[PDB]
């Protein structure tokens, strides 16, 4: 039971340093790099009294990579794993793929081989990135293609930070997202998405943080990515492996776009005043504004939902709780999968970072769900793409890298097929 990870772009390593510090404090790993089976799935054993993670941080720009080299978590990670480039992607799907991508993928390809050859219980891969920029679109789409022909059968769990309807950090992100999704449609077994304004709304109304930063955004995100793999680390009464997320959530080989939401998210003072039990968190996780994406689930229908709890939670109240969710007529499930409920449990509770914004909780849940609610989101991203594509705006840079106007039409009609697939399947 092992799994390799990879981080790409500014979005990748920024949460990678924030997630791995949460991983190390759970297993009693000090930041200096040392203190039986729970840590073997992420951390190796380097001879005697020393460990190293089973992951790599790759990014073309060297400012973030060297920050880890000069950061506090220096001795924990490997020096050679901190891979760095020499030329930036600059919001270009092509520049991080063809010109600059080719002269750096070869150190990246062979490293995953030797990193897997020493391993024996490799379940799959999970990549953290963001299609809202340049590095997370081109280079991420290239590495998954080259290992898919090599491995193929192993799973791939993508984690992208998508743009909001109206809030946006960049301006060319429709071109970056529409191009990279053309390759992601066929090789990605599953891809959990998160919106940038939605996570701000989580800490605004619930955690009452009026002025957070991206560091705080990565803490609760680290709870999500650590909770989905928490069953593999510690013992649980109903164990769920990494391949459970592939069969139980992907109804069709092209429709592989779940959602994500987490609860409870309570402040320190509110934690003592607010009760924590399975009932309120179950009603809170299905709440639409509590989701990590600005899409109305009432407009669509849930194909399937994968529940996974943590902490001391008996299997009685979790079954009685979802039985009440089945009786709620405000939501609506699709007729193609009525029994779309998958519940899991892990005895090890949610951890807490020293000085972190999240408060201690005796139990939590991480709810993943597929639906046609993002069908309008893909229609929204495609609609704004037609405005700039009609004017042929921002095209001279992509063709200035080596591409042409041909595949721009291939990405448009591919989304057109994807849009109607959500409409016809949701009947």
């Amino acid at each position: 039971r092992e799994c390799i990870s990879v981080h790409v772009g500014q979005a990748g390593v920024q949460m990678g340093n924030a997630c791995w510090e949460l991983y190390c404090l759970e297993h009693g790993i000090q930041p200096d790099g040392q203190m039986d089976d729970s840590f073997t799935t992420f951390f190796c054993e380097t001879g005697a009294g020393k460990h190293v993670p089973r992951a790599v941080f790759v990014d073309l720009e060297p400012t973030v990579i060297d920050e880890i080299r000069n950061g506090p978590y220096r001795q924990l990670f490997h020096p050679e794993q901190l891979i760095t480039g020499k030329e930036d992607a600059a919001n270009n799907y092509a520049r991080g793929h063809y010109t600059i991508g080719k002269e750096i993928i070869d150190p990246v390809l062979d490293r995953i081989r030797k990193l897997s050859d020493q391993c024996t219980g490799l379940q799959g891969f999970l990549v953290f990135h963001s299609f809202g920029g340049g590095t997370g679109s081109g280079f991420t789409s290239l590495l998954m293609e080259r290992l898919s022909v090599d491995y193929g059968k192993k799973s791939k769990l993508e984690f992208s930070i998508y743009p909001a309807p109206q809030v946006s950090t960049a301006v060319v992100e429709p071109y970056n997202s529409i191009l990279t999704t053309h390759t992601t449609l066929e090789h990605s077994d599953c891809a959990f998405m998160v919106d940038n304004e939605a996570i701000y709304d989580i800490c605004r109304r619930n955690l009452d943080i009026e002025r957070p930063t991206y560091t705080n955004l990565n803490r609760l995100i680290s709870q999500i990515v650590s909770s989905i793999t928490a069953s593999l680390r510690f013992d649980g009464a109903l164990n769920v492996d990494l391949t459970e997320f592939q069969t139980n959530l992907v109804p069709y080989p092209r429709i592989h776009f779940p959602l994500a939401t987490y609860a409870p998210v309570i402040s320190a003072e509110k934690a003592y005043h607010e009760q924590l039990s399975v009932a309120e968190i179950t009603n809170a996780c299905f709440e639409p504004a509590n989701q990590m994406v600005k899409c109305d689930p009432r407009h669509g229908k849930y194909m399937a939902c994968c529940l996974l709890y943590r902490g001391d939670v008996v299997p009685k109240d979790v079954n009685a709780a979802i039985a009440a969710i089945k009786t709620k007529r405000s939501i609506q499930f699709v007729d193609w999968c009525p029994t779309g409920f998958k519940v899991g449990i892990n005895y090890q509770p949610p951890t807490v970072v020293p000085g972190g914004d999240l408060a201690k909780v005796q139990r939590a849940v991480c709810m993943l769900s597929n639906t046609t609610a993002i069908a309008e989101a893909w229609a929204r991203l495609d609609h704004k793409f037609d405005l700039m594509y009609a004017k042929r705006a921002f095209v001279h840079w992509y063709v200035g890298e080596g591409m042409e106007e041909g595949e721009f039409s291939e990405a448009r009609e591919d989304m057109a097929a994807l849009e109607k697939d959500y409409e016809e399947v949701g009947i």
Partner: protein
């Protein structure tokens, strides 16, 4: 690691270029001699991106000062940070041009370009991997317009793939410091429109308007105006000089702000701009900076943004700050003023922030704006060009160097072309 080689041209380009090395020397903690006396270790982390290491913990800037007159180097060498520059880089001629584009481009330029191309070739071989070049000149005069525009074409021949940034100050109708300004402006833009991939439209008129309204300077000199434009050059190259939560290199802002190959003339700005006598009575958090950034009387160009529509905007930030207040403020400025923003782009704002702000300020930002309102400054100089050109006035000085009359008309054909481009997307 993406080294940038500095290059100067003209009297003004050497002055603002000299101020550029001065202001960044303070935040990096570089002495006037060349030694380091800062406090933070991150200053040495990316000191090589503009400077060159040397013995005794000394750092020499990677600058090349080019001016056809010799007195300009004597003033720069005798400055506060004049000795830090390399003496070999002080290349210069003897006989000035005297506000003649034909001299610095054909006759007086041809004899000096061989002496500067080998110097910048030496500097380009010293770094590990160069990103691009940034130049400072002025459309007025003959040196900065003639020498700068010439080697821009040569650097494009030698480095066609690298980034070619330019900080070019243009004339203005009310403040006219040269009689032959529109001819030099019309001849210079023919090279800037085709060769360089980026351009910053700076105005001297607005640099006098900006100091009265918020700084309240009673006796502003050129050195005070250089402080504003020098700070703008530091903001554009912040994320590669110091780490940040969201990095934006010179290429990362160019791809977002240059939607077409010829539409690359930006419009700069800077904030916070507040006088010393009213610093205590103003806050420094993010919302007051946002409304000041998009204010019409904040930028250092004479263009009215209310008379047009912004193509794209980029607001590089500096210093630790909250991301929710940053992101939410940029939503309302484009939503509440959707009429002054193009509807054929969903989002006209590019965001980026750094953690290491300038010394003496805790939160700051620099504005970069491409808008259709830039054409009003281009047609007025074109009108002054066409008004003076229709009678063939002030051309006998240019034809003496062997310049053809049709080249003025070829430049005129480019002049009404670029203004029509912004009129298309308005």
């Amino acid at each position: 690691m993406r080294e940038i080689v500095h290059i100067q041209a003209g009297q003004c380009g050497n002055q603002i270029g000299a101020k550029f090395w001065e202001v960044i020397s303070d935040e990096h903690g570089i002495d006037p001699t060349g030694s380091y006396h800062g406090d933070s270790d991150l200053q040495l982390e990316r000191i090589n991106v503009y400077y060159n290491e040397a013995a005794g913990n000394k750092y020499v800037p990677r600058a090349i000062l080019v001016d056809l007159e010799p007195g300009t180097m004597d003033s720069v060498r005798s400055g506060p940070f004049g000795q830090i520059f390399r003496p070999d880089n002080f290349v210069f001629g003897q006989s000035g041009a005297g506000n003649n584009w034909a001299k610095g481009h054909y006759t007086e330029g041809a004899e000096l370009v061989d002496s500067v191309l080998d110097v910048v070739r030496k500097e380009s071989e010293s770094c590990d991997c160069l990103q691009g070049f940034q130049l400072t000149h002025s459309l007025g005069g003959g040196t900065g317009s003639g020498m700068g525009t010439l080697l821009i074409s040569k650097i494009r021949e030698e480095y066609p793939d690298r980034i070619m940034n330019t900080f070019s100050v243009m004339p203005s109708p009310k403040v006219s410091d040269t009689v032959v300004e529109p001819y030099n402006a019309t001849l210079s833009v023919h090279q800037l429109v085709e060769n360089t991939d980026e351009t910053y439209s700076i105005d001297n008129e607005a640099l006098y308007d900006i100091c009265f309204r918020t700084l309240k300077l009673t006796t502003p000199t050129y050195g005070d105006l250089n402080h504003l434009v020098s700070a703008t050059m530091s903001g554009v190259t912040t994320c590669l000089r110091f780490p940040g939560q969201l990095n934006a290199d010179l290429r990362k802002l160019a791809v977002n702000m240059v939607p077409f190959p010829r539409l690359h003339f930006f419009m700069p700005g800077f904030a916070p701009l507040t006088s010393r006598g009213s610093q205590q009575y103003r806050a420094l958090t993010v919302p007051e900076l946002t409304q000041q950034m998009f204010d019409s009387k904040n930028m250092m160009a004479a263009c009215d943004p209310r008379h047009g529509r912004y193509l794209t905007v980029a607001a590089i930030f500096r210093g630790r700050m909250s991301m929710k207040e940053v992101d939410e403020q940029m939503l309302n400025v484009q939503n509440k003023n959707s009429s002054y923003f193009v509807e054929w782009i969903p989002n006209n704002v590019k965001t980026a922030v750094c953690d290491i702000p300038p010394r003496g300020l805790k939160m700051s930002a620099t504005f970069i704006g491409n808008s259709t309102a830039i054409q009003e400054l281009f047609k007025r100089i074109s009108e002054q060009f066409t008004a003076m050109f229709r009678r063939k006035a002030f051309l006998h000085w240019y034809t003496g160097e062997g310049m053809d009359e049709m080249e003025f008309t070829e430049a005129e054909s480019n002049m009404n072309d670029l203004v029509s481009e912004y009129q298309q997307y308005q």
